[PDB]
Amino acid sequence: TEMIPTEEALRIVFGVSKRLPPVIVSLYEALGKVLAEDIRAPDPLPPYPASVKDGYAVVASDGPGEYPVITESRAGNDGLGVTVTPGTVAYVTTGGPIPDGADAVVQVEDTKVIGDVSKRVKILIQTKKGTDIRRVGCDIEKDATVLTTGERIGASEIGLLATAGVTMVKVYPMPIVAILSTGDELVEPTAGTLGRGQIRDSNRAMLVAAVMQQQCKVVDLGIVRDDRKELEKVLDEAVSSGVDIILTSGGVSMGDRDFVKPLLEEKGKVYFSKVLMKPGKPLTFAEIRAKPLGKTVLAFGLPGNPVSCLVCFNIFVVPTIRQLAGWTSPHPLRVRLRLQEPIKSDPIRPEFHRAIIKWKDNDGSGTPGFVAESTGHQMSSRLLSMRSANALLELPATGNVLSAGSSVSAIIVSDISAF
Amino acid sequence: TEMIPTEEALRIVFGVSKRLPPVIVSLYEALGKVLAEDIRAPDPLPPYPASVKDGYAVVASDGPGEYPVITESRAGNDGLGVTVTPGTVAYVTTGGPIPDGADAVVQVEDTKVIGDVSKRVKILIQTKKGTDIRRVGCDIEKDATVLTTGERIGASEIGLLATAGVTMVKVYPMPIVAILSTGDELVEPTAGTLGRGQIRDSNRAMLVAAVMQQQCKVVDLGIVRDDRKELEKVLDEAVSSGVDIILTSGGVSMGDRDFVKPLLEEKGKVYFSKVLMKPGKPLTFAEIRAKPLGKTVLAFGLPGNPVSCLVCFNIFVVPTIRQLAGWTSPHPLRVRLRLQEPIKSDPIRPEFHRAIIKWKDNDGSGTPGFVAESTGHQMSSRLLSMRSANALLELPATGNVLSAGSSVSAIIVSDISAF
Ligand SMILES: [Mg+2]
Ligand SMILES: [Mg+2]
Ligand SMILES: [Mg+2]
Predict the structure, then answer these.
(1) What is the CATH number of the domain that holds A38?
(2) Do A384 and B418 touch (CB under 8 A)?
(3) What angle do CA B124, B128, B130 make, to 5 degrees?
(4) B116 lies in the same domain as B185
(5) Could you tell me which of A389, A247, A252 has the C-alpha nearest to residue A318?
(6) Of B202, B212, B332, the CB nearest to A162
(7) Cys-Cys with B246: which of A10, B102, B252, B299 at CB 3.0–4.6 Å?
(8) Which DSSP string do the residues of A57-99 spell out, in sequence order?
(9) How many CB pairs (< 8 A) connect A and B?
(10) Is B212 an 8 Å CB contact of chain A?
(11) Are residues A5 and A51 in the same domain?
């Protein structure tokens, strides 16, 4: 067969893909990236006894009654005020330091201001010691590890970094990706009336947007014609430019002008060039060593057909991006769902059927789960099959018609928030 | 109770949130945004009879045998070459125009080159007319609508825009969001040794990263102290700056220095300020009209506690962002999952329990599905409960202990690709 299964091509790319060296970035540059160090709190949270509620800090043993407001301790006070002796209370807001001597905080809804212009308040409930008080370090202990290496940084992790005072973060960067399209029939997407035999370059803009969705820097190398020396020149510039991944579209098939596959066999080590899969078949993966520091560049000879180009990106390039970016779980999300319509599977090649999936309270069998609708015809040239497709149905090469209501595996390729 | 349920607060914000006027952006600026017009193909795809395979364009009636290669039609040729008469073939690559007279294409694996230096090839199979030929418009018909209004633009949609030659796209923009934190105890996250009663501002950096994850422009207004005139000045500048959403952290509780809620009642129309929910309770939503063009600004008085601040962002601000951005389905993804551990629900307030959910081939009952682990203590001040939390368990106010293995509803707040 010469071609390898998709599970083996993934294992080969996984074994070659190496995590990028960590870098130091600012707080907002660290969003979305994977932590490359442990984060320890230099001080506890809260660093002082803080009030949970707005109200009055009391002595729990005094109980209900009328007491003078001996002092006020709002959020922002230094806490070094008057000691709340038994028989006295202190007004506190949320986050306000608990004055020395207070054992609990009574909610302001459980109090009543007595008198007017010397202030006295009436505690209306009997509270126990420690009520509505955040002890020192109750949320975050001092020197405790709030964030560990390998953890991806989201919005909550950014707040934890700001809580610990970390504004320069050591993370694993995103790979720089160079993208180019091959084909003498390609013209820029700005072209109006097409010439004879000309089509607009769709893969390059598609791969650019796809790499952008992976939060990687894109190096647009433009349209390259089906010329051996030209493709060799662009690849040498791409390898020496400092990129980590090179994405090529087209030129890896069986035509006598497909120079992407041979050139990758010449400049680097091609691990495979054909994969048993639907859609498509040609897919060249090579490891190129930049000749100088010394650097390894991964090359993905993606097929020229728009569907196979984007599918091979979602299955092989996306995990390579995350693995280089330091993800501990680079694999995409895989779920089980029901089929909303009958689908005929290929008898030879396991198909990655494009589908629009959604969560239903009744997936067709009385239980909540995912259901998938087919996007239509699945030819590798019909980019409309990728339109609004958020999952890839992993159909096995059985040749049988999977009726509606059967369960298949699906690779989710984007957030499916469309309820 | 004075406070309204979460379903009603969402209905109020949904009824006030208005979609932003459409703008014209470039191709790469249109990524992630919602289409505000229909996209029609100015020319078919392919615009010419294109070969699917690399091989030879033949006359299907001639059948197998030896034939001369009368011409070559690779990808990039104008297609106005020599007519392939019966008894002749033409070499074609993938995307190459089909010469006039050819009815089918024979795969090069089904051919053999005969002779050498005049070229002759041997067709080894009997093919039917139309095999391995992309007819004009088979993938995309001319004047057909490839993209419709209200469709969010992903990588595949970008390729469709480049296919149709649309480099300037009419989309609905993202709202500009202004963010500020309130609190006399707040210091910048760059502060080292904290002073007495000081904590580092975590909500602002957290909300900035959260709004950035929504692909919105952030207007950082910084830390504002608990001063009535100061907060009034910052809000007047924020309303007149041109932002669409104002996010405030803190100053909406019961303390005598909480000026966010009263000021929003003064400059705009506050629709609610307390919500029946856990964590938290105070949450002020107001609509402010910018006094000049005329503009409506939505204000979210988020609570100061870090957990309640981020939770109220995920439930109320995120759909408001998407609704302003033109999303037809602004609601977050809601699924059903099993509990990996027993959880005690609040008897009064329905809780949004932070959880780390994952898809398992066996969710604990023999069927594949989602399972959720609790993040630990769910106090509104313990931001560690938000750490790596990707779902919000919608626990009902029943006071009963939901044992492990029971099914609850969950709001997914980020892509859960962690397999
Ligand atoms: Mg080609
Ligand atoms: Mg406050
Ligand atoms: Mg998801």
Answers:
(1) 3.90.105.10
(2) no
(3) 120
(4) no
(5) A247
(6) B202
(7) B299
(8) EE-TTT-SEEEEEEEEE-TT--S-S----TT-EEEE-TTPBPP
(9) 347
(10) yes
(11) no
